[PDB]
Amino acid sequence: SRGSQYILTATLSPANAPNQNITWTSSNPNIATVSGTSTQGTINALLAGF
Amino acid sequence: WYSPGGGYSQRTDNDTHTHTISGSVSLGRDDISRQPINTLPPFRAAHIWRRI
Amino acid sequence: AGGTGGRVFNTIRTENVPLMTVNGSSFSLSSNTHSHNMVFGRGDASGHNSSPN
Structure with a gap:
């Protein structure tokens, strides 16, 4: 929704990986953006889009 | 409240707060x-x- | 070779940068509209747009 950003996560197939990290990307970054490796935090900016 | 002065009565039930309540x-x-x-x-x- | 060595890259050292992602947590606090007491007296002069008390 506008402003609100449902926090997501990226669980890997295994429990843990050696030096595992996530280079989170967000297509259409104006609509929303994500950060971190496990958590996403898709904070939205625009009021409409995918 | 719009601070409207009554013609005959007085709006004594409205007042402005001074300090917050904890x-x-x-x-x-x-x-x-x-x-x-x-x-x-x-x-x-x-x-x-x-x-x- | 050398007679003395050290462990820096591969050793049990300290210090690190804590990084992680956490879902948003919201704390709910209720502020009662009452219990704020009263100030001043009957108008007189009263502030415009003031909440009625």
């Missing part, structure tokens, strides 16, 4: 989430320890 709040955050331990880049790294 109240007791409920519980909040419990604790922090998981954190990483050790360095993955250094795992399985070869170390030289042979003496002279």
Whole structure:
């Protein structure tokens, strides 16, 4: 929704990986953006889009 | 309130607050989430320890 | 070779940068509209747009 950003996560197939990290990307970054490796935090900016 | 002066009556039921009221709040955050331990880049790294 | 060595890259050292992602947590606090007391008197002069008390 506008402003609100449902926090997501990226669980890997295994429990843990050696030096595992996530280079989170967000297509259409104006609509929303994500950060971190496990958590996403898709904070939205625009009021409409995918 | 619009500060309207009554023709005959007086609006004595409306007043402007001066200071905030402190109240007791409920519980909040419990604790922090998981954190990483050790360095993955250094795992399985070869170390030289042979003496002279 | 050398007679003395050290462990820096591969050793049990300390110090690190804590990084992680956590879902948003919201704390609910209720502020009662009452219990704020009263100030001043009957108008007189009263502030416009003031909450009625």
